[PDB]
């Protein structure tokens, strides 16, 4: 009837062509205006096997996002291996916009509709479609912002939870807003305000999910063990500015503990800094940008997922320890591409 296969995809968007925003300028020539009448066909009485971790659409996307960033964001100075490139760095307006992908003739996308499907294995409620859902090309570390939510339960996805070296994606069914701000008039200092109560509630629910998946052992959350900031802190781009955010307070193991009413449950404020000297995620190298613009800078974003790495190693104890994930952004893309798989019919 059909055979799973990979191929070249074509993107669709709806960005206005008159806008100066970089995502819109890129999409207006990279993507086709959105289908106003999209259709999805429920496939009756078929169970299909999926593997979110080996699925070419994430690779193609990653290529599209790297092309977008290379074309749009222009650093003052770039350092590649034995290469220095000097180029003007004009200030730009930056805001992720959602985009779809679509297959040409002969190829369709199967989408799993099971509520608790974990990115791999069999799925019973499967449909077919020509185009994906809106996806915002957001780049983030340890946290998955402005994404889609889980439907029934907080879902733990991994190529293999048993392996300590495989990143773990956590899909939330209730987003948490994070409000980061650089006040107008130390121009790099900034902060992010997170509601403590919801944060700790979803944190305890996630902890219980991990306990269920891991023989009810004692779950510990700790800050990262080391690395460059892009991972030891929380990296993102907002209004063209590169924010690194200290998330030490977000893994407080006592606020979920049974210490009754304590200093938790308040609005937790974590420090952040804008840095011009960053390590490019597109490729190895460094990038120096212009200093941040004047005036209020703000971004309110819905944390929808969590990136984690487990320590592991000669456990034989009461506890499993976890630390925030990040690094490879193909996993960030997989976090939303887990539902889709391309298939040939001819």
């Amino acid at each position: 009837v059909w055979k799973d296969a990979d191929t070249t995809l074509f993107c669709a968007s709806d960005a206005k062509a008159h806008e100066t925003e970089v995502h819109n300028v890129w999409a207006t020539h990279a993507c086709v205006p959105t289908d106003p009448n999209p259709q999805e066909i429920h496939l009756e009485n078929v169970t299909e096997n999926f593997n979110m971790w080996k699925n070419n659409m994430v690779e193609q996307m990653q290529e599209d996002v790297i092309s977008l960033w290379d074309q749009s964001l222009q650093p003052c100075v770039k350092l590649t291996g034995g290469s220095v490139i000097k180029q003007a760095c004009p200030k730009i307006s930056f805001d992720p916009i959602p985009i779809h992908y679509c297959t040409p003739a002969g190829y369709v996308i199967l989408k799993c509709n099971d509520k608790n499907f974990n990115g791999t294995g069999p799925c019973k409620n499967v449909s077919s479609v020509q185009c994906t859902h809106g996806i915002k090309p957001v780049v983030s570390t340890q946290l998955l912002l402005n994404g889609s939510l889980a439907e029934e339960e907080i879902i733990i996805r991994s190529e293999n939870l048993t392996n300590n070296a495989k990143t773990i994606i956590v899909h939330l069914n209730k987003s948490v807003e994070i409000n980061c701000t650089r006040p107008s008039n130390d121009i790099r200092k900034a902060y992010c305000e997170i509601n403590g109560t919801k944060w700790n509630k979803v944190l305890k629910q996630v902890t219980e999910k991990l306990k269920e998946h891991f023989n009810n052992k004692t779950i510990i959350f700790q800050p990262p063990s080391g690395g460059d900031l892009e991972i030891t802190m929380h990296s993102f781009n907002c209004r063209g500015e590169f924010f690194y955010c200290n998330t030490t307070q977000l893994f407080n193991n006592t606020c979920i503990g049974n210490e009754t009413m304590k200093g938790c449950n308040g609005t937790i404020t974590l420090p952040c800094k804008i840095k011009q000297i960053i390590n490019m995620w597109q490729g190895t190298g460094q990038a120096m940008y212009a200093p941040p613009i004047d005036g209020k800078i703000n971004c309110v974003s819905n944390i929808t997922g969590i990136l984690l790495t487990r320590d592991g190693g000669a456990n034989n104890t009461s506890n499993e320890t976890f630390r925030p994930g990040g690094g490879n952004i193909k996993d960030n893309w997989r976090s939303e591409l887990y539902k889709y798989k391309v298939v040939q019919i001819e």
Partner: antibody
Amino acid sequence: HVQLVQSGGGVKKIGAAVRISCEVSGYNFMDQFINWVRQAPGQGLEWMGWMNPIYGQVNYSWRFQGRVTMTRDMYTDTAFMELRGLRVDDTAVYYCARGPSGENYPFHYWGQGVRVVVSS
Amino acid sequence: LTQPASMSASPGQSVTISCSGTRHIISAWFQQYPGKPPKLIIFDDDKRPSGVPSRFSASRPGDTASLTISNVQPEDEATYICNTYEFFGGGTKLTVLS
């Protein structure tokens, strides 16, 4: 022809610290993790941690976190491991290792091992 | 894990070393000549790389992964270790019986 060697061992005092560097050749350093494993004299193997050289993703064992720090240098294609605060039991032979293309485990490739003698 | 420390078998016969406690997570097998870095000789339960002979075989039907060696030879005097991710066995030092 995957080649990879160690050049950092020796004989050290009590406590102090030691540095071990493991160079590779035959593939792009950015791909594939590196793992550190210690062999006590006449005793089984013990895994201490691993590193992803892309940004510096490190993962440590509970027995060693807070003691050892793993570092990297992309341009010279060399991984490093520093064992700050070593005792007598740390007298061992140290291995840097990697696995097949794509995935980390198991450890198909082992360097050469280097001696570390924790002295008085 | 669960591994014998030292077996023995005369040249020509067959020997089996089983590592238990794998928790049902694949299996790897390493041969170590004391003094030098080890060398894996099989991977993924029932497959082996090049450079080694068909004298070696293995099977992981569950909690115990067994490794069989026929026609003992003088370089078969080695320590054999079971592997599961970052886990290694106590190693079995098998030697000749001259």
